[PDB]
């Protein structure tokens, strides 16, 4: 697993990692209306998917393989899209905080910290925009913000169930809806 | 006071921050043989030097202003080229770690940590290449690797520490890394 850090894959003024852009654009070209997108088991194994995340046009691949490589990419980032410091803070507040708007404002403040490269928040925004675009054909693909949040929150936060973890999933659900 | 983190200023396959490349190339074009390069102050103050670290072609500036803006850049980085995580570990090493080679081996392992983006080590290497190129016209500019390490180690590490046999060891590895570039 040689996937570089998000901060090593691109820098401002680019808006997202180029590999993630290739994946997302190919998936939206081929899979926007697919009623099992991102919910189907992997026909390929991790080693083969990793091969794909090095090398040529991603439209040539089966869309269910692209969706798996997308998941593989989020799992192989050496640090997750939402860093563990951020997750740890949000989780340790949950008995005491319940306001979703407060968690959301705090997620933005934590992830835009000077100690965290801006690439992390830029990537999260690119992901949220993808997830939101999927949710606009949810009558066909069955992916609304809530389902997208249950699928991807564990890959974004990198967590394997309290009222806490539920609060993280709800944050992502609201963040997808309000784009 | 602005200046983004090294890891936001560029990314692989670029080898260094674009602003730092402009500074180093202009300084080497105009000052390679200058016998007081980096050892004299210019008239400009930090606010004026920071002003320069935004806007023209840097070859237009006085070479002593460029040299001061270089120092200003290393000082205004939100984290130093060699992060405090790395310095804290290197300073904690025992006298039984007598070995310059071991200090260097530990610097490389710690700075290439997954917690530290590759941009930090890449910038350090770009700087070492500059310093090495300076030490090769030492017969004219009077700079050897050891003096370049005494001048720039406090800017690369940015570390308040009493002058110990540890800090002597940090100055020493920078000295060695400058010489062993080519």
Author numbering:
A (entry chain B): 113 to 167, 172 to 276, 279 to 297
B (entry chain A): 113 to 167, 172 to 298
Relevant lines from the article:
A unique feature we noticed in the bovine p85α BH domain structure that was not described in the previous paper, was clear electron density for two sulfate ions near residues K224, R228, H234, W237, and Q241. The residues involved in coordinating the pair of sulfate ions within the bovine p85α BH domain are conserved in the human protein and they adopt similar positions within the structure, suggesting it may also contain a novel binding site. We generated, crystalized and determined the structure of the p85α-BH-R228E protein (2.4 Å), containing a mutation in a potential sulfate binding site residue. In this crystal structure, one of the sulfate ions was clearly absent, and the remaining sulfate ion reoriented itself within the site. No other major structural differences were observed. This result is consistent with R228 contributing to sulfate binding. We recognize that sulfate binding to Arg is very common in proteins crystallized from ammonium or lithium sulfate solutions, but the distance between the two sulfate positions (7.1 Å) is similar to that of the two PO4 groups (6.8 Å) in inositol 1,3,4,5-tetrakisphosphate, raising the intriguing possibility that this surface may recognize phospholipid head groups. The docking model predicts that p85α-R228 makes contacts with peptide backbone main-chains C250 and D252 within the PTEN C2 domain. Both the p85α-K225E and p85α-R228E mutants showed significant reductions in PTEN binding without altering their ability to stimulate PTEN lipid phosphatase activity, whereas the p85α-Q221E mutant behaved like the wild type p85α protein. Several of the p85α BH domain residues that can bind a pair of sulfate ions are also involved in mediating interactions with PTEN, suggesting that if phosphorylated lipids bind to the p85α BH domain at this location, binding of lipid and PTEN would be mutually exclusive.
The p85α protein serves as a regulatory protein for both p110α and PTEN. The p85α protein contains 5 domains, an SH3 (Src Homology 3) domain capable of binding proline-rich sequences, a BH (break-point cluster region homology) domain, an N-terminal SH2 (Src Homology 2) domain (nSH2), an inter-SH2 domain (iSH2) and a C-terminal SH2 domain (cSH2). Importantly, the BH domain of p85α, either alone or together with the SH3 domain, also mediates binding to PTEN via a distinct interaction that does not compete with Rab5 binding. The p85α protein can dimerize and these dimers associate with PTEN, protecting it from ubiquitination and proteasomal degradation to stabilize PTEN levels.
